[PDB]
């Protein structure tokens, strides 16, 4: 597949374990972030002091999650989980496993 | 040209009004941000009522961007202290006609 970069938010929909998430392609970040309101409450988290040059105390998934796209490509990511965030943010941890290129005409 | 997305920082080097800047390709940002520490002090910046979700300074003038293939256009970046890297937002990336592609 192919997606132009425009002033529109560049978005991707995929599954993490059984659940569907939509988020913004975020090439500026090496890690993925899930909005806490979208986090399934039974999924375990670990508090961290990881400095995200966002917040410096994010929660993180305890477990690796299996990501899957609509073409059934898959792999593992371990996202941070942050409140007060308007959109999920797909970072280069995930984008690198989907073999995404940036291309110019 | 082509640039894979990897764990490495995806970077672009270009000119803004004939000074060279290097920055991170930032698809999650609507607007471009230049480090105040990199900002030529003679280039005027102005206060804004704009919030970034911060009340930041902005280039008073449109800048002409140019890439190494001599493509060009205009941007008016925000200018913010205490950032690690310049950030190329979709304002600039949309004008360079950039695709994201999967094999």
């Amino acid at each position: 597949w192919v997606q132009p970069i425009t002033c529109q938010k560049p978005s991707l929909t995929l599954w993490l374990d059984d659940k569907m998430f939509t988020g913004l392609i975020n090439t500026g970040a090496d890690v993925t972030i899930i909005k806490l309101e979208d986090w399934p409450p039974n999924w375990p988290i670990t508090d961290t002091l990881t400095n995200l040059r966002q917040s410096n105390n994010p929660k993180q998934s305890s477990k690796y999650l299996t990501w899957r796209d609509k073409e059934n490509n898959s792999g593992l990511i371990k996202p941070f989980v942050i409140p007060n965030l308007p959109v999920n943010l797909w970072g280069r941890d995930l984008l690198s496993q989907m073999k995404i290129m940036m291309c110019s005409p | 040209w082509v640039q894979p997305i990897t764990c490495q920082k995806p970077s672009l080097t270009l000119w803004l009004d004939d000074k060279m800047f290097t920055g991170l390709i930032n698809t999650g940002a609507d607007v471009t941000i230049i480090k105040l520490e990199d900002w030529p002090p003679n280039w005027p910046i102005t206060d804004t009522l704009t919030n970034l979700r911060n009340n930041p300074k902005q280039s008073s003038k449109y800048l002409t961007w140019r890439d190494k293939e001599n493509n060009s256009g205009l941007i008016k970046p925000f200018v913010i202290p205490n950032l690690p890297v310049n950030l190329w937002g979709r304002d600039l990336l949309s004008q360079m006609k950039i695709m994201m592609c999967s094999p």
Partner: peptide
């Protein structure tokens, strides 16, 4: 606007 970077 919205600005989503961090090491």
């Amino acid at each position: 606007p919205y600005v989503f970077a961090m090491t």
